[model samples]
Target: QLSDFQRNKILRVFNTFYDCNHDGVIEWDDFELAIKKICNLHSWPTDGKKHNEARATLKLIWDGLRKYADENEDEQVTKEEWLKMWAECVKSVEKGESLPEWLTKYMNFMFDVNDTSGDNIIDKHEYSTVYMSYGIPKSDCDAAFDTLSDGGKTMVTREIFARLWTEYFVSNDRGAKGNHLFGTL
Candidate 1:
């Protein structure tokens, strides 16, 4: 669960960049901008090493956003769309019906392990703990965290979560090919 302040901060950020033209809603263009900004902030390769990998991750984020953002073809994503997208992304990975459930479960368990405070949430500190626990070199961890943290914030917003999730879970050529499925709950 996010604190009230954290939630409000996230909403403000979302609305600012996503609500293009100040219409109080996010259209496809706004959504795409946000995704691209996220990728750039994370230093994801744009046209060099691992460029395809980065694009694949971005595509997943877009796919997830498109899945819940404007399912009715209204061309706008409401707050509900934002919340549902986050929840569904987490649930899909945690349940692991389409991919390997064990993989997600393991990641969840690892998250829990790092979240020693038992708040049922993994903040930046907790993420750092997990990264260190994995024996990742400090330099690598710093680089990854630079991408994951979005500028040294301790809290993880849904946008940031989605970015990381896409980078972690997306594959160029894998199950179902170009089609992504929700699997069986």
Candidate 2:
């Protein structure tokens, strides 16, 4: 389980995805732009099947936000509502929360992002980039990857990677691998 301080910090990182324009609120147009940009960050091709999957994953996230977070159908999500939802999500995880269908698919998409070798697995080096992007050191990233990979250092399969992320979200184990998912969050 994440400490309250860490969980609160993680919220700000998540907010960047929705508030790409630096606006306090996440609007439909902002969401759209963010989706494209987020996809681009993964370097997914514009017209490939992977690209389509990214779009679909983003669509699901958007619909869910509108359905669950936006109370007035205003096509806008307030920071307060969004953070509350994640706060609740973390609490719900104490009961072993599962990744929704969309997120399951999204996880694979994310794995693919780092699987630039066109393989279904990612190595420690690849994973280290992600961890380092969040300002973590290579040493700590290596240690955490070792724990999450379950000795999957050289090659963490896509399925394992997904499960690792899911585990990070659901399990309160302070010692869980990928615990530094958002760089020590």
Candidate 3:
């Protein structure tokens, strides 16, 4: 179990992403929009041929959200519920259990690079920078932007940020950047 401080910190991080509209409650649409952003971030390819794959990816995330985001008996995930989900995630990692592959990768990467202070976890600014780094591609940053902004406007939402965190940053198993992708999570 996380200490109260840890729990609150986790909640604050989740709130940074989840509290869309600043309304304090995480509605279904906010959740959906976040997921959509995640999909876009990873270049999941929502256009003509890959629509089914995109939908499938969205379903997978929704399933995870449903399983963990329940704040009350009613089965809806509030901001607090979302925060608890991440708290559980940290606990699971501490126990040496595996998290989903994507999440594991992303967390490990964050832990490695952003721990410049050597504290083992990142603060909010560091976390935001990490997410922004995902916008940079292996080849060219502009190319990455082109892919993300193909149709028009370039916008990164929480869900898309989450999805990219899972896919490119979290899900990759290949050894790169001095990080190993072998953990169960």
Candidate 3 residue-wise lDDT, 1-185, digit = tens: 44554454445444554454456665555555654654464445666434454444545554556665765646456766766666666556555565765454434433444333445433444434434543322343333333433333533334433343433322223322111111111
**lDDT of candidate 1 vs native?**
0.46
Please, what is the whole-model Cα lDDT of each candidate in the order they appear? 0.46, 0.64, 0.45
For candidate 1, write residues 56-99 as lDDT tens digits: 44455445555555667675777766654544544554557353
Best by TM-score: 2
Better of 2 and 3 by lDDT: 2
- What's the true lDDT of residue 126 in model 2? 76
What's the ranking of the predictions by lDDT, best on top? Answer: 2, 1, 3
Which portions of model 2 show Cα errors greater than 4 Å?
A: 1-6, 28-31, 38-45, 96-99, 128-154
- TM-score comparison, 1 vs 3, better candidate: 3
Q: Could you give candidate 2's per-residue lDDT for residues 38-88 as a string of tens digits?
A: 466667668887778666677776776677667667888876676666666
Q: How far off is model 3, as Cα RMSD?
A: 13.2
How far in Å is the alpha carbon of 20 misplaced in model 1? 7.6
